[PDB]
Amino acid sequence: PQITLWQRPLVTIKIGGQLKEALLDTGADDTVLEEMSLPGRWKPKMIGGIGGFIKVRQYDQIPIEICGHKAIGTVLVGPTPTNVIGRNLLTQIGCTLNF
Amino acid sequence: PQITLWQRPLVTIKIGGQLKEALLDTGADDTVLEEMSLPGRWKPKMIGGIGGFIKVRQYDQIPIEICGHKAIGTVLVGPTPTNVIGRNLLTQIGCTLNF
């Protein structure tokens, strides 16, 4: 689909069998979601944004659906102000910017 | 043009008679650039992202050119870790997400 940007590019994602709302963010390198539970062991990671950095838990090879498009990749979990889908997953669903 | 997301979507912008590199950020509500001088009146604003909030100066009706596409709008100036082009300007150059 083609999503204009007059409003936030919020979409429904499915992870761990649950539906959540997330922001398609071309400015984000990675994908970070609000506190939730995920299987397996996690690794530490520090991600930086506009206001500084936050510590997050890194889970790899996690199945995640974005607007119906299936993806399997790294999902970060921590105190993010909002759920954000970064380029690591945007590339998996074949997303591009066009103008 | 069509910008892939394998790498950060960086483009050249023209503003305040200066040439700078900025990031096309669909996850950004506003456009915020690192410290620079801009003409006209301004007012303080607190914007938040991963990490918390930072204080920036808000300049309105500022002419800007992105990848050859002219537009005008609000430009924020402050201690942002990187130059960001938000939705307020992405819409003007007809930028959309596609997959």
Ligand SMILES: COC(=O)N[C@H](C(=O)NN(CC[C@@](O)(Cc1ccccc1)C(=O)N[C@H]1c2ccccc2C[C@H]1O)Cc1ccc(-c2ccccn2)cc1)C(C)(C)C
């Ligand atoms: C390489 O680092 C990243 O890609 N970080 C991601 C990220 O923050 N991306 N962000 C964009 C993030 C976001 O879109 C997330 C958000 C969306 C909605 C609500 C709250 C947060 C954002 O903050 N948006 C705000 C925003 C941003 C600019 C102007 C106005 C506004 C208003 C808000 O909409 C861009 C960015 C890139 C690099 C550095 C950086 C850091 C250190 C060193 C060098 N560079 C700092 C900011 C993330 C997510 C933490 C993985």
